[PDB]
């Protein structure tokens, strides 16, 4: 499978689904991180908060 490791739980759902993270940066969808089946990896892009600093 192109998605990857397809496996079912006791509920018959999907396991280890990779997720994409988007930030609304000036009304444009900019990728800011990726999600593994168990861990989150931010990308090289920065994320701006509604206020000031990126922290």
């Amino acid at each position: 499978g192109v998605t990857g490791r397809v496996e079912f739980n006791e509920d018959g759902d999907r396991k280890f689904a990779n997720y994409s993270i988007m930030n609304l940066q000036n009304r444009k969808l900019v990728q800011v991180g990726i999600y593994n089946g168990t861990h989150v990896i931010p990308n090289d892009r920065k994320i701006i908060w509604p206020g000031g600093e990126t922290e």
Partner: antibody
Amino acid sequence: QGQMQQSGAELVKPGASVKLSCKTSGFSFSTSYINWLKQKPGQSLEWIAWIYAGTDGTSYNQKFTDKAQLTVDTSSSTAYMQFSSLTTDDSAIYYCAREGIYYGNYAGFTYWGQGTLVT
Amino acid sequence: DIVMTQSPSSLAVTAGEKVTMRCKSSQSLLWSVNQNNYLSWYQQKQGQPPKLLIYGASIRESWVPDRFTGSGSGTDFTLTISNVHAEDLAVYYCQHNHGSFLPYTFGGGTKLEI
């Protein structure tokens, strides 16, 4: 290299509707932005609307918010613009273009269709 | 819509000379937080899709030769060619890229003649 191919020329009666197609290829169809522009002959292009294929987010020009509708087909990677209540003012050339974004920053329309004339 | 003012409207020069084309926006295209100008210079030749020439009012594209020089900041911007060639003959447009300043608008344009 990405390619955008538009539909052929249309002769539409006034007050009727036309739905134009714009097949896209050579790039990530889901993660890009496509814009429809109205260009009358001898005139500059008029921005109509933009749509994001990954989220179905739609934004139209106020002049065309009640006139044009946009749809996409992920299986075919083809953009669609349906122009309804057509009038003689709509006798113009419509173009579909793919946005060029560098380092996450928009840098202008880098790809274009061949153009479609609606009479 | 931010009004983009381009000057001159058209010009004709001999090969080898230096030209200057100005772009003026009705509003400041500079965002204070990042101090970047949302201005893009383009080269549009007859019968072809426009080719992105300079973005950020100062940065040339990879395919753009060093002879092109974009300057200006805030509301006023300038496109300058140090060594004008015959191939450069085209109509050049400056367009704002500020997402908070939608919709995107274009200036009047400058026609280059040789």
